[PDB]
């Protein structure tokens, strides 16, 4: 009952639909897509290495738990909203926002990026909670 | 066989640095530069000079266009046919492929030729079980299309 | 256009209601999503269907499609999902413990 | 022009809707929703060059990826049991 | 509009869908739809696709790379779909149409 | 049928110039029918009996009556008077004042943000309450 | 410094968010979230003193104007809800580290509170109608998985009828956003209300009011509306019960109040006939079914109901003297309400039944008990020198002065049939020989139920220093035109 | 381990084709999310997730350098002395590796250390002689250096 034909097809497909779902996201603001369409096709990637293979392998693979992801992208949103309130500005107020971590030196983005990033980090993570809660329940 | 190809990227490279501009006019000429080198010392690699996997695998990506093509037609003369006509099958093929990525561009390339469809592939990597849509049509003529199609197979893996 | 849609967001809110007076669960969750399928198709009719760009300052037509109740449906939408998918896994574990489906027979 | 192949595609999805209406077993229905699934991302191609707009293409290839995704779930269905297995 | 390949494409995408279509329909066996559903409505789709690319490319001079990486995934996936839904189907020892010589 | 009205659903989108709605449509009323699907073939094999929708009038009568209401109110709401709208604003100020080309994204993020983060928090409350559902068995 | 109105909301947020992290450690959730609803109730106080100090706050969330972004509004009574809400969440809390066990508490139940008591503080301050859509989903899904939280057959089962009833409600709420946006074009309150007092003698404007009636209806139990609620509530545990009738029936009245005092003020008389007489049928229904019942939620629940007819009915009237008695009433009846599910829990703890016929004899071994739930129960009924006596004596007054003196009869028949029930209670429960239950010394949670009980008791004799914040609350419900010209810059 | 160095490339070449810009810093973007994408798909491949080779050949760079500097303080403090101290040896070692390359880069490293020099590795590829400069101050203890050199040789190639 080997699914050498799935498994290599999945192995192929997985990387298109990974960048999908990254041009996807970061494509918002200009094009359609956004935090939410992004989020959910990353979770379908990683549904698509579920349907592939077992459900410890496939946290042996990708080696997070989402409890963790929907606290920190929260997180993220409401620390974006903090940040706009400290310096006399009310809360959500989106000014642009210099990133040299270092990488790729004064990285200016606007800061509606970062909360749709929360958004993205809470939509996966909220997938996959829903998807691999019922997978093991028996 | 990649092994090769990376060699040859980062001769490049190494041609784009040993002059001061850096462009990809200059990535070409280094490429190329590389490309005479790499096949000075053949010897050295071991399984080929790497232009012959690149020209298989595009006579490759060719039959699987021209079999979509011939596919798609004898399916059209099949069903504006009066669909009294057909025989069906399903049969065993010996496999002496090995690794899983040449058993699936085996099946991926099978199953989009005129009249077959595969099924069952054993547990095993010894057989092959596929489905005919024409048994008296193409049951020999069709395995000879396999057996050439598999040979393409293994002289891409050399 | 606009009277096509009012007459088939009725018959979505005639058959959602249908469903859900009904004896079964599963047939009430069935219900519940065409409710909200008429609910968003509502709100995208009453916010107009006159003829324009998409949403997006890219293409630089005239007169675009009004921008607020697309945005008012995505998030109605991920709401009614969130509760969607909550009052399944509920039917589910409804299902698993007590062990009936009639909804008049649940007392 | 383009209206004619949009009622050949209507056609087409009305007759991949009779074969999953019928049809005895459950494989039939299968790959009729999926054929249909994937003449529905014709349409949104075909209404896409309709209405001059180069704004549907994502869901084309979403068309695309859900349809596998959908199919290959319920293929793992059918053959014995589970859609995702158990840790060893 | 104004080209005759992309006219010719984007007709015979759809003559070649509704030529799936019609073979859905009269075909007996679930392996014979297979066959037909998943060849013909496989180059329906891509004869369409590469249609629109080409007419956005064309009258707008947009180079839109989705329908490309569309047209590489359909043509990727609809007969690995069509090969798991056959092998589901004879696992279910389900077999219809008169069946001839074959092997388990 | 139900996925098919969802699909269809999407196609409404698509055909009434709504992308973002087309797009997140389609794969919620796939993850959805999954679900439907999870609760369908766990229904206990006795007293089930696969029986048809029993016909009651009364039901049938205010099914009808329910429907043909909310028809009339949108009908009378529509087409009385009216101020326009204000999203002349929306698209007046999308790119000169926010950054962005979008204006379905630009109002869920920059211009009316604030409620995006709590559905965002109905989400994460929905994912923790099916996980409490399914792990918490003290019966 | 302008983001203090925002203080009430972000403050448990956070606080949720940061609950997810660790749920097996019980005791660092515990102290977490009791720092957190004190911080709650300091910032709240704070509001109040802000908002009582100069004019009503308005803040627009991003640097966007008033009619183009979301502004968040606190007048003086939302001010004044958000520190009722404080003060029961905090009793709430407490009672719940003495009450709920352990399995229920590893398993995220205090970041559930955190997010009911978000959902409920955010819906008492917005100024749209769609963010308050999105902070009742929050509330609302907040209290299904607290409702459920457990997992035996009865909560499972009532589960299923509350989340059904929220659904429906949910979608008509949509379908009434969806008909006055094409009405009007907006989606704040204040330039709503211009819009609609510009336009004000239409009868679909009359039609969509009367469909928020329905939806605010079904949210907070008016009849013909209140058939979920009696199963609803008897499902939950005892603090959970106690934030249910506390707080989500209260944010109906409070919609209800805002919506016909700001929004639908044109065409007033049919919409106050029908208001007055589906709060005297929710008044008859809640003191019939707490005559009915020998069971003490039951009791409480059909209270709860009767309470809520005699605000309503207290809105029906657009006289400030009426308006003072139900805000009045309100905050008074929101702190009694989770006082007395906290009795009726701590009773059933002592008695393992809840059935007044089984049990008999409690002041000779619980005095302080018994004699605290006299004082609530003689509260509850409007007793004058304690806390509910006010609101209803200035409701009397109100609907004698514009000539309605048998709905005033009826307000004060029905504060002695509600007397008779919780004097049911305490007459069969407390007194009596001794035959029911067995000696237990009770603990800990004695003492947030004495808190609520000294705050309603000083509540009561306090009149004069909690008056000025219920007059400024007046005199910006029943004038409408400083609320749009706060907002509306 | 250059499959998928090159599976990378052509990863960022995707992500490059997948918008309509051409630049490094989309190259190096997509490098970054094809480097995530193999580190989903580590599975498949059989070698190793390919940054652990990468810094083990920094680390024999930085070993090399390193070595040099040592041994020619060595030979600094041999050369001023009074010349009559050193004693030498020429000595065997046995052999585990394999492949000509890790023997050669075996031996360019074992050359550089202080105190030794190669001559005569064997016929087969099982043993190498080696000249030592100092008999009784380096025979044990850089005999345990070159034990840890061979053992990282071998962490090389997996
Ligand atoms: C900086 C200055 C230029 C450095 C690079 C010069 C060319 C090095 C490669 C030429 C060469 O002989 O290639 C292989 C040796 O590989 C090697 O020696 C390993 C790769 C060396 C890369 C050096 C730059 C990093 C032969 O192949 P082979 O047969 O020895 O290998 C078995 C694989 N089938
Ligand atoms: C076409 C659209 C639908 C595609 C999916 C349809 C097939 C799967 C539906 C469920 C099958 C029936 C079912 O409940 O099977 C159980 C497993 O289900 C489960 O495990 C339920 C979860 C299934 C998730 C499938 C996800 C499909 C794709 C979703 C959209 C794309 C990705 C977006 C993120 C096995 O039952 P049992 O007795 O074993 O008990 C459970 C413990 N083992
Ligand atoms: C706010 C107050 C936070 C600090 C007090 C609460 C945590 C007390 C210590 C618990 C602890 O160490 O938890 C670890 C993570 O902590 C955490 O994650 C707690 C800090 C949360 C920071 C939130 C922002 C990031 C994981 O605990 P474990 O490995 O011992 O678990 C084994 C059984 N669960
Ligand atoms: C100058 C102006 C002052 C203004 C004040 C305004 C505020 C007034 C609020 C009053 C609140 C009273 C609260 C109830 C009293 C609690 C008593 C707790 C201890 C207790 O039960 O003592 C019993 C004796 O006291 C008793 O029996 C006494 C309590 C019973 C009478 C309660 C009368 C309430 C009248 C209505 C409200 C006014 C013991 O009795 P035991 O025999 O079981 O001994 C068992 C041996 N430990
Ligand atoms: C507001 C209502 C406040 C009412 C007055 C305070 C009630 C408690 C008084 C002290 C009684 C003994 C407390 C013992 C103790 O450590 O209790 C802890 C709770 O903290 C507490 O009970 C202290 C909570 C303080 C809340 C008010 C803070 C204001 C600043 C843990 O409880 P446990 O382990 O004793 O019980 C679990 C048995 N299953
Ligand atoms: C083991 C221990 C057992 C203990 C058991 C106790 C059981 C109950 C026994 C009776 C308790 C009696 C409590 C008496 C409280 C006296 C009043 C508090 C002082 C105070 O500042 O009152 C007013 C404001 O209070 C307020 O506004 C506060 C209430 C409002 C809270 C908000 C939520 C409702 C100001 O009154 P004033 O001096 O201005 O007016 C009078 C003429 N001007
Ligand atoms: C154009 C659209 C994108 C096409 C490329 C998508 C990613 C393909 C590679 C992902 C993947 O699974 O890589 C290997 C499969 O290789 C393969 O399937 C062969 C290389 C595929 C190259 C495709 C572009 C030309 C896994 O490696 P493996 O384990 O299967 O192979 C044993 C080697 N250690
Ligand atoms: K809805
Ligand atoms: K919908």
Redesign the pocket.
């Known amino acids: 009952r080997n699914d050498v034909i799935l498994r290599t097809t999945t192995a192929v497909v997985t990387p298109i639909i990974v960048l999908f779902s990254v041009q996807l996201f970061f494509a918002g603001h200009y094009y359609p897509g956004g935090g939410f369409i992004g989020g959910l096709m990353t979770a379908g990637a990683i549904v698509l290495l579920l349907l592939a293979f077992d459900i410890e392998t496939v946290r042996k693979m990708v080696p997070i738990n989402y409890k963790w992801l929907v606290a920190i992208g929260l997180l993220f949103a409401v620390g974006t909203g903090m940040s706009s309130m400290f310096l006399d500005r009310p809360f959500l107020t989106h000014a642009y926002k210099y990133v040299h971590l270092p990488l790729l030196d004064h990285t200016s983005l606007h800061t509606a990026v970062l909360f749709d990033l929360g958004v993205y980090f809470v939509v996966v993570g909220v997938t996959m909670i829903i998807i691999e809660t019922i997978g093991e329940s028996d | 066989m990649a092994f090769q190809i990376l060699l040859n990227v980062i001769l490049a490279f190494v041609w784009m640095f040993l002059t001061v501009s850096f462009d990809g006019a200059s990535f070409l000429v280094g490429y190329m530069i590389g490309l005479f080198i790499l096949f000075i010392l053949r010897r050295f690699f071991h399984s080929r000079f790497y232009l012959v996997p690149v020209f298989v695998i595009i006579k490759l990506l060719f039959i699987f266009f021209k079999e979509l093509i011939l596919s798609n037609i004898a399916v059209a003369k099949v069903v504006m046919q009066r669909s009294l006509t057909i025989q069906p099958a399903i049969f065993a093929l010996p496999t002496e492929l090995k690794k899983e990525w040449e058993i699936t561009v085996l099946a991926m390339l099978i199953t989009l030729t005129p009249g077959t469809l595969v099924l069952d592939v054993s547990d095993d990597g010894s057989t092959l079980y596929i489905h005919a849509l024409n048994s008296p049509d193409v049951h020999e003529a069709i395995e000879s299309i396999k057996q050439s199609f598999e040979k393409t197979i293994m002289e891409v893996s050399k | 256009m606009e009277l096509l849609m009012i007459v088939v967001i009725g018959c979505l809110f005639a058959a959602a209601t249908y469903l859900l007076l009904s004896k079964s669960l599963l047939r009430i969750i069935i219900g519940t999503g065409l409710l909200s399928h008429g609910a968003h198709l509502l709100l995208l009719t009453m916010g107009g269907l006159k003829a324009g760009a998409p949403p997006l300052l890219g293409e630089k037509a005239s007169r675009y499609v009004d921008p607020l109740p697309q945005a008012l449906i995505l998030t109605a939408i991920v709401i009614s999902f969130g509760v969607t998918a909550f009052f399944l896994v509920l039917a589910y574990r409804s299902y698993q413990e007590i062990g009936t489906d009639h909804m008049e027979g649940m007392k | 022009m383009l209206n004619i192949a949009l009622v050949i595609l209507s056609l087409a999805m009305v007759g991949f809707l009779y074969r999953v209406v019928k049809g005895p077993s459950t494989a039939d229905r299968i790959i009729a929703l999926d054929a249909m699934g994937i003449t529905l991302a014709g349409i949104v191609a075909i209404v896409s060059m309709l209405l001059n707009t180069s704004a549907f293409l994502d869901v084309i290839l979403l068309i695309g990826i859900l349809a596998f995704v959908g199919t290959v779930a319920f293929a793992k269905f059918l053959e014995k049991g589970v859609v995702i297995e158990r840790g060893n | 509009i104004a080209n005759a390949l992309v006219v010719v494409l984007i007709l015979l995408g759809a003559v070649l869908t509704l030529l799936s279509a019609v073979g859905a329909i009269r075909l007996p066996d679930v392996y014979t739809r297979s066959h037909a559903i998943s060849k013909s409505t496989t180059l329906g789709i891509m004869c369409i696709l590469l249609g629109a690319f080409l007419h956005f490319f064309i009258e707008n001079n947009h180079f839109n790379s989705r329908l490309l990486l569309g047209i590489v995934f359909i043509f990727m996936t609809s007969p690995v779909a069509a090969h798991l839904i056959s092998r589901a189907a004879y696992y279910a020892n389900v077999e219809r149409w008169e069946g001839t010589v074959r092997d388990d | 049928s139900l996925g098919a009205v969802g699909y269809a659903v999407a196609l409404f989108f698509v055909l009434f110039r709504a992308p973002d709605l087309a797009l997140t449509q389609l794969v919620i009323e796939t993850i959805s029918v999954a679900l439907f699907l999870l609760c369908f073939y766990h229904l206990p094999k006795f007293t089930q009996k696969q029986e048809s929708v029993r016909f009651h009038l009364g039901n049938a009568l205010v099914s009808l009556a329910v429907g043909m209401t909310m028809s009339i109110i949108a009908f009378l709401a529509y087409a009385g008077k009216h101020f326009d709208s204000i999203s002349q604003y929306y698209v007046d100020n999308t790119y000169e004042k926010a950054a962005g080309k979008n204006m379905v994204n630009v109002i869920l993020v920059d211009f009316r943000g604030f409620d995006t983060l709590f559905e965002i928090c109905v989400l994460a409350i929905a994912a923790l309450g099916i996980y409490a559902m399914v792990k918490l068995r003290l019966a | 410094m302008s983001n203090l109105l925002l203080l009430p909301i972000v403050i448990p947020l956070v606080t949720a968010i940061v609950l997810i992290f660790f749920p097996k450690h019980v005791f660092w959730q515990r102290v977490v979230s009791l720092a957190a609803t004190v911080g709650l109730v300091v910032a709240s106080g704070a509001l109040l003193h802000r908002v009582h100090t100069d004019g009503i706050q308005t803040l627009n969330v991003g640097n966007w104007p008033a009619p183009f972004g979301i502004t968040l509004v606190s007048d003086s009574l939302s001010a004044l809800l958000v520190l009722t809400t404080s003060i029961i969440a905090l009793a709430c809390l407490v009672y719940s580290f003495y009450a709920i066990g352990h399995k229920r508490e590893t398993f995220y139940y205090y970041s559930f509170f955190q997010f009911l008591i978000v959902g409920v503080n955010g819906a008492f301050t917005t100024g749209d109608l769609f963010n308050l859509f999105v902070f009742f989903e929050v509330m609302l899904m907040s209290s299904y998985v607290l409702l459920v939280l457990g997992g035996t057959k009865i909560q499972l089962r009532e589960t299923i009828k509350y989340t059904l009833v929220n659904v429906i409600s949910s979608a008509l709420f949509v379908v009434a956003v969806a008909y006055l946006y094409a009405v009007t074009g907006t989606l704040n309150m204040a330039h709503l209300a211009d819009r609609i007092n510009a336009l004000g003698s239409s009868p679909i404007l009359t039609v969509i009011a009367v469909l928020f009636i329905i939806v605010f209806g079904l949210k907070g139990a008016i009849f013909p509306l209140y058939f979920w609620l009696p199963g609803a509530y008897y499902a939950p545990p005892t603090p959970v019960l106690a934030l249910f009738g506390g707080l989500l029936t209260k944010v109906g009245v409070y919609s209800i109040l805002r919506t016909f005092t700001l929004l639908f003020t044109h065409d007033a008389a049919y919409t106050h006939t029908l208001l007055a007489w589906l709060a005297l049928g929710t008044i008859i229904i809640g003191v019939i079914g707490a005559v009915a019942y020998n069971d003490m939620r039951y009791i409480v629940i059909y209270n709860i109901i009767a309470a809520v007819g005699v605000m309503i009915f207290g809105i029906s009237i657009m006289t400030p003297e009426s308006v003072e008695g139900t805000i009045f009433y309100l905050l008074q009846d929101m702190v009694m309400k989770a006082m007395l599910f906290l009795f009726v829990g701590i009773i059933f703890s002592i008695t393992r039944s809840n059935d007044i016929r089984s049990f008999s004899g409690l002041?000779?071994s619980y005095?302080?008990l018994?004699?605290?739930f006299?004082?609530a129960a003689?509260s509850l009924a409007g007793?004058p020198?304690?806390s509910g006596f006010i609101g209803k004596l200035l409701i009397v007054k109100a609907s004698f002065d514009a000539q309605l003196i048998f709905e005033a009869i009826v307000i004060l028949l029905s504060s002695l049939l509600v007397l008779y029930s919780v004097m049911k209670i305490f007459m069969n429960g407390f007194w009596g020989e001794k035959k029911g239950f067995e000696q237990k010394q009770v603990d800990g949670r004695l003492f947030p139920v004495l808190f609520l009980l000294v705050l309603s008791?000083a509540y009561g004799?306090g009149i004069e220093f909690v008056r000025p914040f219920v007059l400024d609350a007046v005199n910006v419900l029943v004038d409408p035109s400083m609320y749009i010209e706060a907002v509306l810059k």
């Open positions: 002041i000779t005095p302080l018994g004699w605290a006299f004082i003689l007793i020198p304690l008791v004799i």
